[PDB]
mmCIF file with all atom_site columns, C-alpha atoms in Angstrom:
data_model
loop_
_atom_site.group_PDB
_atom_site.id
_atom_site.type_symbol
_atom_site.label_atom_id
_atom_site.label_alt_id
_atom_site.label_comp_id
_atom_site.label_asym_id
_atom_site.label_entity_id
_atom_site.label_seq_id
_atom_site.pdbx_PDB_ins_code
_atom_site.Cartn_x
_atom_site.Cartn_y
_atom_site.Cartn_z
_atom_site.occupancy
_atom_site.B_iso_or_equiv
_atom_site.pdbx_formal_charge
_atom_site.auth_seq_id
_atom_site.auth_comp_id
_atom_site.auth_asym_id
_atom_site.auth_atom_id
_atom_site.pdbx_PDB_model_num
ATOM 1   C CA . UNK A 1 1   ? 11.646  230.802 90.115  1.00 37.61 ? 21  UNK A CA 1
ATOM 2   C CA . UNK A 1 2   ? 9.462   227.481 90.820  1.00 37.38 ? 22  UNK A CA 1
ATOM 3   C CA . UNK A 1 3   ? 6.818   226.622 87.812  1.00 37.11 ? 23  UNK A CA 1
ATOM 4   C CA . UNK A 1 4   ? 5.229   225.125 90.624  1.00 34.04 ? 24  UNK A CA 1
ATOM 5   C CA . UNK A 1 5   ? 5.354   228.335 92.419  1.00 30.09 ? 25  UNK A CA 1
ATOM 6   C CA . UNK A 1 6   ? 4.535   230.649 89.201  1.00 29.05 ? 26  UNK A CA 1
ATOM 7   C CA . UNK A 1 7   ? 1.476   228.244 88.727  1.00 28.09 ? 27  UNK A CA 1
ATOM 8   C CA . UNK A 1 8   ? -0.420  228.921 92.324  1.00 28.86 ? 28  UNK A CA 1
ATOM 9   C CA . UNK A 1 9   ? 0.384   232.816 92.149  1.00 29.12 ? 29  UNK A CA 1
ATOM 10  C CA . UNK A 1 10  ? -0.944  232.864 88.812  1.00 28.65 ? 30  UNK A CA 1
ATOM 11  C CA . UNK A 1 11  ? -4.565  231.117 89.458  1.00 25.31 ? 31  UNK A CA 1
ATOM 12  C CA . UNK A 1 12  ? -4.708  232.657 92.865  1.00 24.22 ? 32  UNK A CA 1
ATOM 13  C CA . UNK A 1 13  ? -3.976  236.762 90.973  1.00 21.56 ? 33  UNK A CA 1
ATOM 14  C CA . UNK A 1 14  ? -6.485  235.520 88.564  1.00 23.71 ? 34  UNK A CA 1
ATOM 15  C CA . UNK A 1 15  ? -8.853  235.232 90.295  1.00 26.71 ? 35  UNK A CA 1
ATOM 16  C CA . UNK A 1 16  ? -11.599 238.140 91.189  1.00 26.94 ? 36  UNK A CA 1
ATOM 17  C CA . UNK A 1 17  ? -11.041 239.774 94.759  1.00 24.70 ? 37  UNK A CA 1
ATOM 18  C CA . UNK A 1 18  ? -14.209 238.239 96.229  1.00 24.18 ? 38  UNK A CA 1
ATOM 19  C CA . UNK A 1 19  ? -13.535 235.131 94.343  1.00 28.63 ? 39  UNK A CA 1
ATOM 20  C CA . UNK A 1 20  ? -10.520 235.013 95.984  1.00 32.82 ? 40  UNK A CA 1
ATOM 21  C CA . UNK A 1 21  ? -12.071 234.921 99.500  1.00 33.67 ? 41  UNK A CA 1
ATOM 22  C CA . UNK A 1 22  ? -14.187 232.021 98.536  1.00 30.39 ? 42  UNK A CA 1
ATOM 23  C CA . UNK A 1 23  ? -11.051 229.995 97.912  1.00 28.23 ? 43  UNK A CA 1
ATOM 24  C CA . UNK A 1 24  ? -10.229 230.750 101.413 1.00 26.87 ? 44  UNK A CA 1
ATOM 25  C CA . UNK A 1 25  ? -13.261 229.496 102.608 1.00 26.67 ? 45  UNK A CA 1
ATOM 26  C CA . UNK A 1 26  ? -12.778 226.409 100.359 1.00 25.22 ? 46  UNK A CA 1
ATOM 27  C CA . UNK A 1 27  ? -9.827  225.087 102.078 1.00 25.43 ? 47  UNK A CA 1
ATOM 28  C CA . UNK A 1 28  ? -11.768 225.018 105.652 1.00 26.90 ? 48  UNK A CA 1
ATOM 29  C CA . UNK A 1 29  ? -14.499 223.689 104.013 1.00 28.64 ? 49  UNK A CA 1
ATOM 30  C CA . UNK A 1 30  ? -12.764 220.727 101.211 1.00 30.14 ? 50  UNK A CA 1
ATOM 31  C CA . UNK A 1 31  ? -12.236 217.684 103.736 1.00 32.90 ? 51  UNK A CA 1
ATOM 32  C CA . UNK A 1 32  ? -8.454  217.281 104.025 1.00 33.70 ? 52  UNK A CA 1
ATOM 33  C CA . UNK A 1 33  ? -6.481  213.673 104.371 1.00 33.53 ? 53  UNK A CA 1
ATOM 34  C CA . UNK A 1 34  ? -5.015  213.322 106.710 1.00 34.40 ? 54  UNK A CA 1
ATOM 35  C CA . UNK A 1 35  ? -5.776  216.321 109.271 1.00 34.06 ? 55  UNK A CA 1
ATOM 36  C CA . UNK A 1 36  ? -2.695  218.370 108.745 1.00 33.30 ? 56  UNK A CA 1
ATOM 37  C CA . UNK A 1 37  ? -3.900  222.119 110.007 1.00 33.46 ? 57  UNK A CA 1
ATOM 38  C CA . UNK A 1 38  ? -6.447  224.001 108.267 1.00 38.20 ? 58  UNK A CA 1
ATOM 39  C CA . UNK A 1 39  ? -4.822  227.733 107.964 1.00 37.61 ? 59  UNK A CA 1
ATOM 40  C CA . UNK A 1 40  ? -7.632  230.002 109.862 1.00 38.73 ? 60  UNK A CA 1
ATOM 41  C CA . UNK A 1 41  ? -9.197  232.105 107.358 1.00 40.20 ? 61  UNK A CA 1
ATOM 42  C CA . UNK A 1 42  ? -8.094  235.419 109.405 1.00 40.68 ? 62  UNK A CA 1
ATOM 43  C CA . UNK A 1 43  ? -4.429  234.424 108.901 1.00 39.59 ? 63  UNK A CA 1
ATOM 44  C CA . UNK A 1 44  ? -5.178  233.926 104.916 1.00 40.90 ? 64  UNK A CA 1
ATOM 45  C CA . UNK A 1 45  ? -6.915  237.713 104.321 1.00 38.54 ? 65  UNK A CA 1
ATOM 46  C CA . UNK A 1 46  ? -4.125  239.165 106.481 1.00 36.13 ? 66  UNK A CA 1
ATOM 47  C CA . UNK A 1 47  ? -1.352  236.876 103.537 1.00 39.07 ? 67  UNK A CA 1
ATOM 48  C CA . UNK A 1 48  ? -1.935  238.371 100.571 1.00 41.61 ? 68  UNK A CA 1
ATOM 49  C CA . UNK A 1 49  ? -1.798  236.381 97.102  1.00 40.06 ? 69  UNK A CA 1
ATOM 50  C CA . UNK A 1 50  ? 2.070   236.418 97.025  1.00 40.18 ? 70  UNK A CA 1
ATOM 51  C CA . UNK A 1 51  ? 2.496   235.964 100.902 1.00 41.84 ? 71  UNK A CA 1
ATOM 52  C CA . UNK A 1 52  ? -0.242  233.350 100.752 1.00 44.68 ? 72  UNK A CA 1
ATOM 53  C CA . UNK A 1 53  ? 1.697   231.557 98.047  1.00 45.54 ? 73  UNK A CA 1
ATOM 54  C CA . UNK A 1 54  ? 5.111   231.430 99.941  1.00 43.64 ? 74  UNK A CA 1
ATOM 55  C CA . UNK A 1 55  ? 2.816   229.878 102.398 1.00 43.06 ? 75  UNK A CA 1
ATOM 56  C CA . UNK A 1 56  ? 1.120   227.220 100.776 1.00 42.26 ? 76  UNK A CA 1
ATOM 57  C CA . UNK A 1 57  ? 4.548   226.054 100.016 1.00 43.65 ? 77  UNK A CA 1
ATOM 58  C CA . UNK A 1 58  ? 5.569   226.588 103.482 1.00 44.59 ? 78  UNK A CA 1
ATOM 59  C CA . UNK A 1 59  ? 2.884   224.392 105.278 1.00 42.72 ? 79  UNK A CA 1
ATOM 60  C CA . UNK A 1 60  ? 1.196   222.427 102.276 1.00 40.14 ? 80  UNK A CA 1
ATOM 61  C CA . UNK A 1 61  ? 4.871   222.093 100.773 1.00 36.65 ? 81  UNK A CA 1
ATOM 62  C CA . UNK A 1 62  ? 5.245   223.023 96.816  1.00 34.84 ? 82  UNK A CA 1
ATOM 63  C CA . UNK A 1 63  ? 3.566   220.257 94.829  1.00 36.38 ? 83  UNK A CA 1
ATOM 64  C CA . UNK A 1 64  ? 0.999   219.050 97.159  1.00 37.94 ? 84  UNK A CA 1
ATOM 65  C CA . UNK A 1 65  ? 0.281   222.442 97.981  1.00 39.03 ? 85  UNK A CA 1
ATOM 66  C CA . UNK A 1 66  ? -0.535  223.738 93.787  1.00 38.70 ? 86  UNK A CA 1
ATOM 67  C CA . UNK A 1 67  ? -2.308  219.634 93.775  1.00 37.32 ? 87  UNK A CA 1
ATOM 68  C CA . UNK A 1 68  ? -4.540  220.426 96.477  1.00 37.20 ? 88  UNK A CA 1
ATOM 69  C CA . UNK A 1 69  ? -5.466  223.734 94.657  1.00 36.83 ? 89  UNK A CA 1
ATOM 70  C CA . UNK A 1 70  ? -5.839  222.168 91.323  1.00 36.58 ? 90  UNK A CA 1
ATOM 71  C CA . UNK A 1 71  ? -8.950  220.113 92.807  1.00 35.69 ? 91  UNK A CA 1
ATOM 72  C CA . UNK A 1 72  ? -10.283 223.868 94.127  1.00 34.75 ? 92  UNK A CA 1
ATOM 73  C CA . UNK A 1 73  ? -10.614 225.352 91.274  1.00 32.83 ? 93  UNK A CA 1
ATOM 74  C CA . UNK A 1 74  ? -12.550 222.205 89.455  1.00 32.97 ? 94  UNK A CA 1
ATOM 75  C CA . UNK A 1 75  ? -15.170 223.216 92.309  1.00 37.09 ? 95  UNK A CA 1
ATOM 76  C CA . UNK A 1 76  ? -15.175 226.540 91.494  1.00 37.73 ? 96  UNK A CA 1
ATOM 77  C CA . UNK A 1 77  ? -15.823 225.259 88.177  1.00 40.22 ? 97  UNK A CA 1
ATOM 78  C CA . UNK A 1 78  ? -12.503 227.119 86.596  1.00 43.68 ? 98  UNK A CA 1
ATOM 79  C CA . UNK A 1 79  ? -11.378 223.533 85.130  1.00 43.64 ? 99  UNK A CA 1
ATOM 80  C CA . UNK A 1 80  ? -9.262  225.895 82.399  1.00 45.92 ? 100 UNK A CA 1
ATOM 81  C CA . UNK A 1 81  ? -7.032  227.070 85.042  1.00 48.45 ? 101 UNK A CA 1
ATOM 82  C CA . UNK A 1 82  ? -7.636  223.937 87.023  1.00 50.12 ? 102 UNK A CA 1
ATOM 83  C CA . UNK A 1 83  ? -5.835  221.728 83.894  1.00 51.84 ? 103 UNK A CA 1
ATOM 84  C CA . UNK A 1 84  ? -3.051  224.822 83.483  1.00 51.66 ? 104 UNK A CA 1
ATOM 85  C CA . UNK A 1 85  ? -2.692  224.574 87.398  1.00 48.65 ? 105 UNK A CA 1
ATOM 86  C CA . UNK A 1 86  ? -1.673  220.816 87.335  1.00 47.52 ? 106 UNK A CA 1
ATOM 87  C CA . UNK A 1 87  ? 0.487   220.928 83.904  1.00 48.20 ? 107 UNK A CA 1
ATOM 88  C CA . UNK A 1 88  ? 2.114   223.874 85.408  1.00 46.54 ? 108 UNK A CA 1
ATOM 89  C CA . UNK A 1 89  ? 3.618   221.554 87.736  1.00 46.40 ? 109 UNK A CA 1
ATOM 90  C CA . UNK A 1 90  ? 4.136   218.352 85.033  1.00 48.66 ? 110 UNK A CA 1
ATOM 91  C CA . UNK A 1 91  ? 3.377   219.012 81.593  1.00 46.14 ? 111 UNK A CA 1
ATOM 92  C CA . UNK A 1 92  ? 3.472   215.719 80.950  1.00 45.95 ? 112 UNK A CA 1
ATOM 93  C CA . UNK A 1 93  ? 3.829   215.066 76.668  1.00 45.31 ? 113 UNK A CA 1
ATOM 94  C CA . UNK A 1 94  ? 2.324   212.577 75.087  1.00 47.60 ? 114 UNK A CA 1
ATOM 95  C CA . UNK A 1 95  ? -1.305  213.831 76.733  1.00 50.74 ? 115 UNK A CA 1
ATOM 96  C CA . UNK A 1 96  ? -3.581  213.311 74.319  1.00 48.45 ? 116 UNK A CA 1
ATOM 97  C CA . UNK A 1 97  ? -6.148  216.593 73.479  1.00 48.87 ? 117 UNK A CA 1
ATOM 98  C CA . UNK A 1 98  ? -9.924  214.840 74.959  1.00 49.42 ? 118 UNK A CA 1
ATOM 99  C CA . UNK A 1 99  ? -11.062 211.369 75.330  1.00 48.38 ? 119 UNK A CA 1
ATOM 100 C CA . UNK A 1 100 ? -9.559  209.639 78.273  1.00 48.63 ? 120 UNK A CA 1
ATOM 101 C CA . UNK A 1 101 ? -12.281 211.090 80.490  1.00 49.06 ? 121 UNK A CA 1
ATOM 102 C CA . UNK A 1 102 ? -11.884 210.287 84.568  1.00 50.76 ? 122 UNK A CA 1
ATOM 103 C CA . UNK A 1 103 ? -11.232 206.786 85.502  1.00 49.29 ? 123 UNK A CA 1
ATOM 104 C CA . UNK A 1 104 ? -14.288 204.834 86.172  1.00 48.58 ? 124 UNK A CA 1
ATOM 105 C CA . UNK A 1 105 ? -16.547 205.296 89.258  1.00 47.63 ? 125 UNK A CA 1
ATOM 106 C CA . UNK A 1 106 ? -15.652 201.375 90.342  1.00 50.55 ? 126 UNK A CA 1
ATOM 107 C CA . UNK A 1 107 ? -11.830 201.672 92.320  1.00 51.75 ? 127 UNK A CA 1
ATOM 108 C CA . UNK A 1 108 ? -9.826  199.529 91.076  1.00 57.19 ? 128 UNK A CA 1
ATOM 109 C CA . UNK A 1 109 ? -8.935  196.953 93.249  1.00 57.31 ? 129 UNK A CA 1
ATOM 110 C CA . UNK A 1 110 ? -4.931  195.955 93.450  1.00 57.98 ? 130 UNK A CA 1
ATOM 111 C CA . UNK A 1 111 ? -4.885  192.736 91.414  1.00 58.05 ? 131 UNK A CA 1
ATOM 112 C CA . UNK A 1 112 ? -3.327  191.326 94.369  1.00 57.28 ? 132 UNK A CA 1
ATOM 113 C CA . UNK A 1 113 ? -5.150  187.989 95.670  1.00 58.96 ? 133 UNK A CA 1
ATOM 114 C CA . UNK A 1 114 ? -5.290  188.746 99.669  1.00 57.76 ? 134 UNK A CA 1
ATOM 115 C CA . UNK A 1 115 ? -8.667  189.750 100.756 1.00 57.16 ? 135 UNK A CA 1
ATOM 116 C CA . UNK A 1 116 ? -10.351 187.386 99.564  1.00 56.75 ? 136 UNK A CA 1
ATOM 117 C CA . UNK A 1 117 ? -8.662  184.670 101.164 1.00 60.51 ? 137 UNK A CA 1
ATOM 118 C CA . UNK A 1 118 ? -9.641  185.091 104.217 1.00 58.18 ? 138 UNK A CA 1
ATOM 119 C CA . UNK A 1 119 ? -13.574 184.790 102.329 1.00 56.85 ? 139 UNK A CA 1
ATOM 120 C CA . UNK A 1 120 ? -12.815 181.283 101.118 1.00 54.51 ? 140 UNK A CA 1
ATOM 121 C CA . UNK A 1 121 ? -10.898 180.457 104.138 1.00 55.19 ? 141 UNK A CA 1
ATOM 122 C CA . UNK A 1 122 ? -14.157 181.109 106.739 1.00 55.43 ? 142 UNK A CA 1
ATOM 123 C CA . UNK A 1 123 ? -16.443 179.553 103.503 1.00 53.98 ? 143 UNK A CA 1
ATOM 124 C CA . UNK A 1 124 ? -14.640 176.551 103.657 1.00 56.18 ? 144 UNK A CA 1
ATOM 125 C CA . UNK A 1 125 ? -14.580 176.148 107.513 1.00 56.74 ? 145 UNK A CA 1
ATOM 126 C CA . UNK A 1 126 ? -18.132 177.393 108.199 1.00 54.05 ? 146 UNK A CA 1
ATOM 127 C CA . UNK A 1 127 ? -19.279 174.584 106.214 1.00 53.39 ? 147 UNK A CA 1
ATOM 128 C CA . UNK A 1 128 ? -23.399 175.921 106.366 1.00 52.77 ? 148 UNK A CA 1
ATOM 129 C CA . UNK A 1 129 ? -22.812 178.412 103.930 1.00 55.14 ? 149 UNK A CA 1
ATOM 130 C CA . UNK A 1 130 ? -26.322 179.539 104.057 1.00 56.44 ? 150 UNK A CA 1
ATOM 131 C CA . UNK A 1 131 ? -26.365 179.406 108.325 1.00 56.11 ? 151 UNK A CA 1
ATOM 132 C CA . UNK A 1 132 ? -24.804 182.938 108.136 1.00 55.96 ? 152 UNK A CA 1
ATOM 133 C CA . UNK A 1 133 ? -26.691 183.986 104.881 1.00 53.98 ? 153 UNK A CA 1
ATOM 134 C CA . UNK A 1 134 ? -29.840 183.508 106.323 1.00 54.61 ? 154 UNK A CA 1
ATOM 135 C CA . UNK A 1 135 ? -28.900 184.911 109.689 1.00 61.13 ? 155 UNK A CA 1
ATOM 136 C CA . UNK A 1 136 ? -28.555 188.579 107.472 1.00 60.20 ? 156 UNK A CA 1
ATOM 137 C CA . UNK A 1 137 ? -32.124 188.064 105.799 1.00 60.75 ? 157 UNK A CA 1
ATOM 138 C CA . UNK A 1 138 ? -34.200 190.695 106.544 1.00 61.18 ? 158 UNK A CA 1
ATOM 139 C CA . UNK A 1 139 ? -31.487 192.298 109.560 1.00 61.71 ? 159 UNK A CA 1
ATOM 140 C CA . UNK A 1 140 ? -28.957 194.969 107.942 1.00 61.55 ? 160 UNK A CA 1
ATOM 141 C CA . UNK A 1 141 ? -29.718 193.739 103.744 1.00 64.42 ? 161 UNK A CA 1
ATOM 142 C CA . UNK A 1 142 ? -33.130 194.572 101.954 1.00 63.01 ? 162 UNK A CA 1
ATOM 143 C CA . UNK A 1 143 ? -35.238 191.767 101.168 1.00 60.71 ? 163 UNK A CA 1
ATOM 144 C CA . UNK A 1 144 ? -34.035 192.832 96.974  1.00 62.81 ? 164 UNK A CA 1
ATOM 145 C CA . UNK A 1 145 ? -30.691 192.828 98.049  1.00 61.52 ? 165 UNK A CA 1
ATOM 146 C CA . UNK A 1 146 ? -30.299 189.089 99.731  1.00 63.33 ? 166 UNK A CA 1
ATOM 147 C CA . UNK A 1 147 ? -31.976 187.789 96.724  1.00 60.74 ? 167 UNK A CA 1
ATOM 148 C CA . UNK A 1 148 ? -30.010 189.699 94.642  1.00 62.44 ? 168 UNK A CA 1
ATOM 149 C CA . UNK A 1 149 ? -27.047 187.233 96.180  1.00 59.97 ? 169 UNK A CA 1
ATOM 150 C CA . UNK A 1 150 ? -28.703 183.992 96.428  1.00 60.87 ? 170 UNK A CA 1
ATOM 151 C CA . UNK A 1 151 ? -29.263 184.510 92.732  1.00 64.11 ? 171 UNK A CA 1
ATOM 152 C CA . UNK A 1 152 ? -25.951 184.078 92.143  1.00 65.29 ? 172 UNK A CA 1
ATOM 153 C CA . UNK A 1 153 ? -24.596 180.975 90.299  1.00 68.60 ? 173 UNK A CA 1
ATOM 154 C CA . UNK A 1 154 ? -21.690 179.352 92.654  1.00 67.70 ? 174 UNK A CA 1
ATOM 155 C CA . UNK A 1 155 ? -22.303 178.884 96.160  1.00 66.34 ? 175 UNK A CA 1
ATOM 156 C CA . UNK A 1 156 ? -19.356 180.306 97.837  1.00 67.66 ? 176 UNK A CA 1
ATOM 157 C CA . UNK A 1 157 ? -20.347 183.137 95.391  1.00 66.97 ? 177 UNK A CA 1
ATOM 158 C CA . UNK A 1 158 ? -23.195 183.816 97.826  1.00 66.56 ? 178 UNK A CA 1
ATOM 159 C CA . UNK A 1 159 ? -20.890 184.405 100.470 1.00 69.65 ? 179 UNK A CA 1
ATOM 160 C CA . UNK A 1 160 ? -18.375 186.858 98.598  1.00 72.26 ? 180 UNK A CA 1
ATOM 161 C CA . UNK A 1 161 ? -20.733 189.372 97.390  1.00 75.10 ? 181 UNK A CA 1
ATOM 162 C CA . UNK A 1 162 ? -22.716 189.545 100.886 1.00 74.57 ? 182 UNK A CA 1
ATOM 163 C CA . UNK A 1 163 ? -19.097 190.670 101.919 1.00 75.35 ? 183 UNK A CA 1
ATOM 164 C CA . UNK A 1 164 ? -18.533 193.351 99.189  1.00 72.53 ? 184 UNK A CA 1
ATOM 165 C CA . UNK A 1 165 ? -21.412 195.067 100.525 1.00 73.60 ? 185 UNK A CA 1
ATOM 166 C CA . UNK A 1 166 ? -18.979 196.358 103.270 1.00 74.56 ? 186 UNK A CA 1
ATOM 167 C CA . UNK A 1 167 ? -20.598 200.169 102.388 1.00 75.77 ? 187 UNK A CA 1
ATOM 168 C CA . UNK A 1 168 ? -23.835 198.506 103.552 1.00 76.83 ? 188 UNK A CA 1
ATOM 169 C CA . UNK A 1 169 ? -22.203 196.911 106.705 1.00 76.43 ? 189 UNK A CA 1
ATOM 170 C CA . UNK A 1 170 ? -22.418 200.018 109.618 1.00 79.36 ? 190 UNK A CA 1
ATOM 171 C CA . UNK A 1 171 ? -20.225 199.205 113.230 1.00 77.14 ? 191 UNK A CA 1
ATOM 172 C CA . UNK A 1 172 ? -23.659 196.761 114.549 1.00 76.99 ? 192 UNK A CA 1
ATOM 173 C CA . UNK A 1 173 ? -23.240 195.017 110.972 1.00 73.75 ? 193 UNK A CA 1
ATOM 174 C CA . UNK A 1 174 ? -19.742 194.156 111.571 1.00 76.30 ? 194 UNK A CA 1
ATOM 175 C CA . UNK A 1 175 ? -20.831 192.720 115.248 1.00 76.12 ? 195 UNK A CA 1
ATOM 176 C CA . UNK A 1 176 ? -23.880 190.523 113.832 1.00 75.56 ? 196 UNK A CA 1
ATOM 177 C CA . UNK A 1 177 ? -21.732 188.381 111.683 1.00 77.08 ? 197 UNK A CA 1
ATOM 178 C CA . UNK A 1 178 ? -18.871 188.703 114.326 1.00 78.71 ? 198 UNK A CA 1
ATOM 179 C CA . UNK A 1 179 ? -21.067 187.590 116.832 1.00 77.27 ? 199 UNK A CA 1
ATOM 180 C CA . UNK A 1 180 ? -22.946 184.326 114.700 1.00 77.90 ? 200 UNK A CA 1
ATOM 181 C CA . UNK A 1 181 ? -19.560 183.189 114.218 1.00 77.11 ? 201 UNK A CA 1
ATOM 182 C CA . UNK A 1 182 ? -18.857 182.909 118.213 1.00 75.64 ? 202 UNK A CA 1
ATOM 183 C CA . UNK A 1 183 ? -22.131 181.331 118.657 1.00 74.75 ? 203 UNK A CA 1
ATOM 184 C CA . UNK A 1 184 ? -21.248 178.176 116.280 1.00 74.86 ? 204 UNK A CA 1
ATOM 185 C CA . UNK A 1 185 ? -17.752 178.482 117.213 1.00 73.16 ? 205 UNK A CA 1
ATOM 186 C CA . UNK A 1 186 ? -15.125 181.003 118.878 1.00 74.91 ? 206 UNK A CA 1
ATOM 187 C CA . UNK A 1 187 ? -12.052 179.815 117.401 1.00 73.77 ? 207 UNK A CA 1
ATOM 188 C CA . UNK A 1 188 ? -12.904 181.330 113.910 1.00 73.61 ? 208 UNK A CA 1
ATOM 189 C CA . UNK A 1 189 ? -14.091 184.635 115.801 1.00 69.59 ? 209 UNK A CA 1
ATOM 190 C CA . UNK A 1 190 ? -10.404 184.581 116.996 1.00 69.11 ? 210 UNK A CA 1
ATOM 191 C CA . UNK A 1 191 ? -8.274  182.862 114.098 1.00 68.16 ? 211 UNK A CA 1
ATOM 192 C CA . UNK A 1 192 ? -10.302 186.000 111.746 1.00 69.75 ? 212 UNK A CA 1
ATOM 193 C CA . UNK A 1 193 ? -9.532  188.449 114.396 1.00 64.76 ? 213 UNK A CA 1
ATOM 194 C CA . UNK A 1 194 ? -6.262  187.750 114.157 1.00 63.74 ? 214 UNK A CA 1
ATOM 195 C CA . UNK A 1 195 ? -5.514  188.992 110.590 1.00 64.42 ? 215 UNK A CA 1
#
């Protein structure tokens, strides 16, 4: 019994015998979340697909464990048993046949106002907004890229896109802004610390 169960022995007995192996190599391969345990590939050829499956429920639990798979198979490009895989588990009615495509590229940020008040909170209290602008010309953002925010129309909007470009900012980015801040004063350095 367990659809959930049914669903992972199914994809995993479809699957060709050297096919199979690849999924193996998959899981030690597909970054996990947190860390859990990857399963050593030894211990998965001596499982078979039906001792294997009791296991994936074992360690990677029932759902989480079919979920994990479900994102697999899309690699292996098998997105047929990939969508079977996850409906397996939840059906779900109401899903309509093709159009909703994946979520946009952008994530979604909680419509929760929070991080950016700690933007206008320093803008307001650093007073020269362009002191730390112009301490970032030419150092960690392209010559394009500053522009690109001094173009923008507000002022304090100058100051909250230089901070979206966290994917920009590396460990020595974080310091050089860090650091300005101490050198016009310390108690911001310590009141933005403090989170």
């Amino acid at each position: 019994m367990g659809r959930a169960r049914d669903a992972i022995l199914d994809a995993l007995e479809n699957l060709t015998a050297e096919e199979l192996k690849k999924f193996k190599l998959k899981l030690l391969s597909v970054p996990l979340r947190e860390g859990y345990g990857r399963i050593p590939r030894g211990a998965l050829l001596s499982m078979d697909a039906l001792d294997l499956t009791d296991k994936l429920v074992s360690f990677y639990l029932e759902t989480y464990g079919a979920e994990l798979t479900a994102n697999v198979l899309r690699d292996m490009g098998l997105q047929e048993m990939a969508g079977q895989l996850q409906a397996a588990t939840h059906q779900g009615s109401g899903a309509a046949p093709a159009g909703i495509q994946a979520p946009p590229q952008s994530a979604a940020k909680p419509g929760l106002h929070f991080i950016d008040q700690h933007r206008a909170a320093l803008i307001a209290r650093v007073t020269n907004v362009e002191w730390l602008l112009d301490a970032l010309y030419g150092k960690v953002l392209t010559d394009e890229q500053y522009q690109a925010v001094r173009a923008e129309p507000t002022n304090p909007s100058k100051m909250r896109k230089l901070f979206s470009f966290t994917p920009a900012w590396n460990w020595t980015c974080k310091d050089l802004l860090l650091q300005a801040l101490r050198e016009s004063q310390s108690y911001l350095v310590e009141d933005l610390e403090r989170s």
